Write a protein that binds this ligand. Structure first.
Ligand SMILES: CCCCCCCCCCCCCCCCCC(=O)OC[C@H](COP(=O)([O-])OCC[N+](C)(C)C)OC(=O)CCCCCCCCCCCCCCCCC
Ligand SMILES: CCCCCCCCCCCCCCCCCC(=O)OC[C@H](COP(=O)([O-])OCC[N+](C)(C)C)OC(=O)CCCCCCCCCCCCCCCCC
Ligand SMILES: CCCCCCCCCCCCCCCCCC(=O)OC[C@H](COP(=O)(O)OCCN)OC(=O)CCCCCCCCCCCCCCCCC
Ligand code: SF4
Lengths: 155, 70, 57, 175, 83, 318, 88, 98, 46
């Protein structure tokens, strides 16, 4: 059936994208170091897709780790547009989520939502290294429940 | 452990196996259970046309020996 | 108390220059670096199998 | 077809020359010569001359022309003209097209082209000789005489290259 | 003498690649001169019949040239056989 | 007939190139004490498929400063070159028995540098342009030693026929006769193939991606696969040159087993060598090349030309 | 023919899989010029293998080694007068 | 005479016209001068290989190794007029009016 | 047409330098993160 055909194609594309993200590091503060332990063998992430290819052009998901500043605001943003789609951003830690410990400050924008469309939020100050692995995994399952080719078929 | 890279290695050996057997077996099939007669110099070339033209079926690989002449 | 670090002196004798010349031509400290990584290849990994394995707290 | 393959390649060789003779952007002009260099070896290859042909790939196409476009890369203006750009460049290209079309048409119908050199218009293959070469490649055994008969050639070409190395520094020294 | 030996020793101390290059190039230029197999290399080089041994018109008075290919007269490469 | 052999050669080569990404992330990790790609696919057998599929489904970006004409020929000029370079490889009986195969392999190896040169010009960015400029200059500087090493090695072998390699290297590996040139050759392979300590462009942080600075998924598949493609072969060329196997005419299976294992082991060392050494600074590349590698190679060519004359050991070209 | 067929098939495969990826989704000069001169001098001794089998290889020995020392001589003059120590 | 040689002979002529006519850039002129010796190389090899003039195989290799020496000189001069004038445009090279 | 310079030295033009001021920092993990660097260089020499 036609819906089966578009379902198999949807699974094939979704399974590929969710399983082989190529995140680009945008660590700015202590939120960078603890994600950078996910690189350490204890919570290896290269076990599933996410690898060292880096090269923000060759990146699917962006992890914004640390406090976001007003002078950092445009340069981070222009990175996001240059990042080709499907682009998703991961909000790392209380500071990148909603400003955290510097919410009432003049050189920080409260949260990354004011700048980029945040798809996933990982609480912590800093979030434990494995907790981000869960956040990546839940983002992986978020891609699994995507119906790009299905929604096109309805149209 | 360390042997978890072996199945990653083994599949490669299967992939690189294909060119080795193919270009050898295809040679055997296109030469009739033989190998492609190399022609690195003129002698090795007109030798083939000598054999290709005498065979009658215009194939160098098929060879007629003592049973042909009297 | 204190201690220098880069105060080693290179010996100019026939023996010492031979090892250094051998090291430069026949790369040995590079091979020593190779041996360090290779010995670690046969070392078991410490990759916690998330989510099934979870880090200690 | 396949009989005219040397003619076919020779035709691409001529139009390849119009590519860089029209003087386009130096990178694009180099590319037009790169293909022209590539096909020219095939013309040599079809006549034999494997080693002589292979150099055109190696020491000229992958050689002289690599540093050629390399110089154009770090030199030249910030606005490189795209092949169309100046109407003269396309005018030169179409100009090169009409020369090769008129002769080739004249070549394949009347076969009596007399432009400068009188040349009769037959296929490429009616010029090859006949005979077996034994067990030695004629091209390979010819340039291998560089060290058995190429006595005065090696002495002079070697000396000039050493002077070539010294002249390039002296000009590039900047006094 | 003493300075020359010290010159070589410090050359090997800091510049071991070049002294290796000069030594190898230094040798590679002089053994081929006094080599005892160089003449052998030439001898086997001419003893490779690329071109056919065209026969000669038998007018007599020449015993060195064999009448038959298997005849003992004429050159032989028995030396090439054992070496 | 002929065409079925063409796919039977290039297609398994291409599918092996995709998989090499897995081991690059895995055997490094098993040395880095990591695990390598394991979760996706059994034992990470499916990660290269996941890697390759998004690159052929992600959006292909063409920067406005990039000439689309130059943006498309270069990836084809690179990948196709790697595949046609495989045609004279002496797999038992080679697909192409070019008597000048050694020159044939080297000639289009020089053709490879046009792939990076045009891409650096096509990208048209200040940092990108200089990154390619001081990348091509590296590769060309390493070809002169490449040619000299080749010239010395086949001088003792014979003619340039790649099939003759298995004949000269009958009883002893050729490395036992030119081991000072073998490491001279091996490091030269490490530099043309653009791998650490000469990763340079493709360095994940050296030039972030070098030839892939602005060049992302889509056409970037034919520009990050080609470099890995030359890795398997240029090591395999070393395998034929110095580690030649035996070939029984009645059983070409033995040489297929031996050569593939030898070239696969060499590629392991090639992947071993990235995970054990830093990256040469630009000046250090030329300092290593012109002033230490270049003079030594000349001296060894001095030695290897006289030695057959020294011992009456000239090889038969026919 | 076979050679042309091989290269033609490679181009189409590169072209085909490119299309699916596009529609379905003084120092710098000196290193160049020094390589150019060395590369040209390299092409001189490429015919060496067959030249090693000439019938007067003694004259070959003097002159094949001649080009190689000139390769060294060209580098030696380059090295001593700065040269390979590129402008920095 | 075979049309492949006339194809080469014009190839010199179109290269000759490009070298003489000039448009803007000395890079293109140096490129045009290289097509000169290029078309000379195939023409030389074609005649020499056809006639089995064994010793004459000398000249093709000798031809371009000396033609490349023009590139060694020609390329160097360009960068100097590029260093001083800026762009290497021929129009800039007019100081020696007198 | 002005007379040629007596010393035969034509007058130098102004500077023709290409000292691009590279912007290191907020794109490269090479800068370890937020390390915007402003510096000019002679192609390679800072
Ligand atoms: C199953 C797999 C089996 C093979 C595993 C890999 C073997 C090779 C890598 C490890 C080698 C031993 C490691 C070691 O002890 O290294 C330190 C040692 C010593 O390193 P070192 O730097 O302490 O040198 C000490 C000696 N002096 C001071 C005189 C210089 O390495 C060696 O001894 C290496 C010797 C061989 C080097 C050959 C290099 C050239 C090769 C040319 C091509 C052949
Ligand atoms: C009768 C005998 C005739 C022949 C005799 C020949 C001479 C004796 C033998 C000499 C040694 C062999 C030839 C020279 C080799 C070294 C060349 C050189 O420049 O060395 C110094 C060079 C440069 O050392 P450097 O830069 O520290 O010092 C050089 C000298 N100055 C400072 C003055 C410039 O060392 C290297 O290049 C190091 C290696 C760089 C690449 C990194 C990866 C290395 C991987 C090593 C392990 C794997 C090996 C695989 C081997 C192949 C396997 C198939
Ligand atoms: C056996 C008989 C011979 C034994 C050995 C004799 C020769 C000993 C050589 C000692 C080392 C070389 C000489 C020397 O002192 O060179 C100094 C200098 C080094 O320059 P550099 O490394 O840049 O350091 C200074 C600038 N910072 O040098 C230079 O700047 C110039 C270096 C030139 C290198 C040329 C290498 C050519 C290839 C190798 C040699 C081939 C054979 C040459 C002919 C040999 C004939 C005997
Ligand atoms: S959320 Fe906490 S750990 Fe993360 S950047 Fe802010 S203060 Fe630092």
């Amino acid at each position: 059936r036609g819906e089966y055909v578009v379902a198999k194609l949807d699974d094939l594309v979704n399974w590929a994208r969710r399983s082989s993200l190529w995140p680009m590091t945008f660590g700015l503060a202590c939120c960078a170091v603890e994600m950078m332990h996910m690189a350490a063998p204890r919570y290896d992430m290269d076990r599933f897709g996410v690898v060292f290819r880096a090269s923000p052009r060759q990146s699917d998901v962006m992890i914004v780790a640390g406090t976001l500043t007003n002078k950092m605001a445009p340069a981070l943003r222009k990175v996001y547009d240059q990042m080709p789609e499907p682009r998703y951003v991961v909000s790392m830690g209380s500071c990148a989520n909603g400003g955290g410990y510097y919410h009432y400050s003049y050189s920080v924008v409260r949260g990354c939502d004011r700048i980029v469309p945040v798809d996933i939020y990982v609480p912590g100050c800093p979030p434990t290294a494995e907790a981000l692995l869960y956040g990546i995994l839940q983002l992986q399952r978020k891609i699994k429940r995507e119906k790009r080719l299905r929604i096109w078929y309805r149209r | 452990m360390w042997f978890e890279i072996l199945p990653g290695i083994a599949v490669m050996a299967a992939c690189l196996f294909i060119p080795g057997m193919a270009t050898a077996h295809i040679h055997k099939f296109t030469n009739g259970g033989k190998e492609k007669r190399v022609a690195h110099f003129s002698y090795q070339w007109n030798l083939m046309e000598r054999d290709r033209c005498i065979s009658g079926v215009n194939r160098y690989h098929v060879t007629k020996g003592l049973e042909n002449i009297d | 108390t204190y201690k220098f670090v880069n105060m080693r002196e290179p010996s100019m004798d026939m023996k010492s220059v031979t090892d250094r010349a051998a090291q430069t031509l026949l790369w040995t400290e590079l091979v020593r670096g190779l041996g360090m990584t290779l010995s670690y290849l046969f070392r078991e990994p410490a990759t916690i199998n998330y989510p099934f394995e979870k880090g200690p707290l | 077809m396949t009989m005219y393959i040397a003619f076919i390649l020779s035709t691409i060789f001529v139009i390849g020359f119009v590519g860089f003779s029209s003087k386009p952007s130096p990178i694009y002009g180099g590319l037009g010569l790169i293909v022209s260099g590539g096909v020219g070896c095939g013309i040599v290859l079809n006549f034999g001359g494997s080693f002589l042909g292979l150099m055109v790939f190696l020491i000229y196409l992958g050689g002289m022309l690599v540093v050629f476009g390399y110089t154009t890369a770090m030199a030249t203006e910030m606005y490189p003209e795209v092949w169309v750009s100046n109407k003269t460049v396309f005018g030169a290209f179409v100009s090169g097209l009409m020369m090769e079309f008129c002769m080739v048409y004249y070549a394949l119908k009347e076969e009596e082209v007399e432009i400068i050199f009188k040349f009769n218009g037959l296929g490429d293959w009616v010029i090859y000789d006949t005979g077996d070469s034994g067990f030695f490649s004629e091209e390979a055994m010819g340039i291998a005489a560089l060290y058995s008969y190429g006595t005065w050639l090696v002495i002079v070409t070697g000396w000039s290259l050493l002077i070539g190395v010294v002249v390039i520094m002296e000009i590039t020294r900047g006094n | 003498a003493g300075r020359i030996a010290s010159f070589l020793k410090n050359a090997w101390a800091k510049e071991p690649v070049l002294v290796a290059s000069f030594a190898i190039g230094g040798l590679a230029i002089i053994l081929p001169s006094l080599s005892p197999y160089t003449n052998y290399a030439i001898r086997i080089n001419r003893a490779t019949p690329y071109n056919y041994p065209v026969p000669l018109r038998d007018d007599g008075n020449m015993p060195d040239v064999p009448s038959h290919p298997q005849d003992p007269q004429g050159p032989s490469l028995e030396w090439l056989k054992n070496l | 007939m002929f065409m079925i052999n063409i796919l039977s050669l290039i297609i398994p080569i291409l599918l092996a190139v995709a998989f090499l990404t897995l081991v690059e992330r895995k055997v490094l990790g098993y040395m880095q004490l990591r695990k390598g790609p394991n979760v996706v696919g059994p034992y990470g057998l499916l990660q290269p498929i996941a890697d390759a599929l998004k690159l052929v489904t992600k959006e292909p970006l063409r920067p406005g400063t990039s000439s689309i004409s130059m943006f498309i020929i270069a990836p084809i000029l690179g990948l196709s070159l790697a595949l046609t370079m495989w045609v004279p490889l002496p797999m038992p009986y080679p697909l192409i028995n070019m008597n000048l195969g050694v020159l044939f392999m080297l000639a289009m190896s020089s053709l490879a540098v046009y792939s990076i040169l045009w891409s650096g010009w096509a990208s048209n960015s200040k940092y990108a342009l200089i990154g390619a400029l001081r990348a091509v200059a590296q590769t060309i500087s390493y070809e002169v030693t490449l040619a000299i090493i080749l010239l010395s090695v086949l001088l003792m072998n014979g003619s340039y026929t790649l099939s003759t390699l298995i004949t000269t290297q009958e009883h002893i590996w050729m490395i036992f006769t030119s081991w000072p040139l073998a490491m001279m050759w091996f490091i030269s392979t490490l530099a043309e193939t653009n791998r650490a300590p000469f990763d340079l462009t493709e360095g994940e942080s050296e030039l972030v991606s070098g030839f892939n600075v602005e060049y992302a998924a889509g056409p970037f598949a034919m520009f990050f696969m080609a470099e890995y493609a030359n890795i398997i072969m240029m090591n395999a060329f070393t395998a034929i040159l110095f580690l030649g196997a035996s070939h029984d005419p009645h059983t070409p299976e033995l040489y297929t087993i031996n050569f593939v294992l030898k070239t696969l082991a060499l590629t392991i060392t090639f992947l071993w060598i990235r995970a054990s050494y830093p990256r040469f600074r630009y000046d250090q590349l030329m300092h290593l090349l012109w002033k230490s590698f270049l003079p030594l190679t000349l001296a060894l060519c001095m030695w290897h030309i006289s030695l057959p004359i020294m011992t009456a050991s000239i090889p038969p070209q026919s | 023919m076979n050679i042309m067929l091989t290269l033609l098939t490679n181009v189409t495969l590169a072209s085909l899989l490119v299309l699916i990826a596009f529609w379905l989704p003084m120092k710098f000069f000196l290193v160049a010029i020094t390589f150019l001169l060395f590369d040209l001098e390299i092409a001189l001794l490429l015919p060496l293998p067959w030249a090693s089998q000439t019938n007067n290889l003694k004259t070959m020995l003097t002159m094949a080694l001649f080009l190689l020392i000139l390769l060294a001589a060209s580098l030696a003059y380059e090295w001593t007068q700065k040269g390979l120590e590129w402008a920095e | 005479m075979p049309l492949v040689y006339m194809n080469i002979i014009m190839a010199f002529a179109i290269a000759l016209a490009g070298l003489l006519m000039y448009r803007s850039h000395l890079m293109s002129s140096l490129l045009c001068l290289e097509g000169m010796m290029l078309s000379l190389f195939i023409m030389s090899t074609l005649i020499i290989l056809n006639t089995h003039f064994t010793l004459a195989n000398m000249m093709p290799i000798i031809l371009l190794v000396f033609a490349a020496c023009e590139a060694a000189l020609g390329l160097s001069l360009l960068v100097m007029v590029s260093n001083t004038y800026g762009t290497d445009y021929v129009q800039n090279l007019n100081l020696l009016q007198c | 047409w002005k007379p040629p310079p007596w010393n035969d030295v034509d007058p130098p033009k102004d500077t023709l330098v290409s000292n691009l001021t590279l912007n290191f920092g907020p794109q490269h993990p090479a800068a370890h993160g937020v390390l915007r660097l402003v510096m000019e260089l002679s192609g390679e020499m800072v």
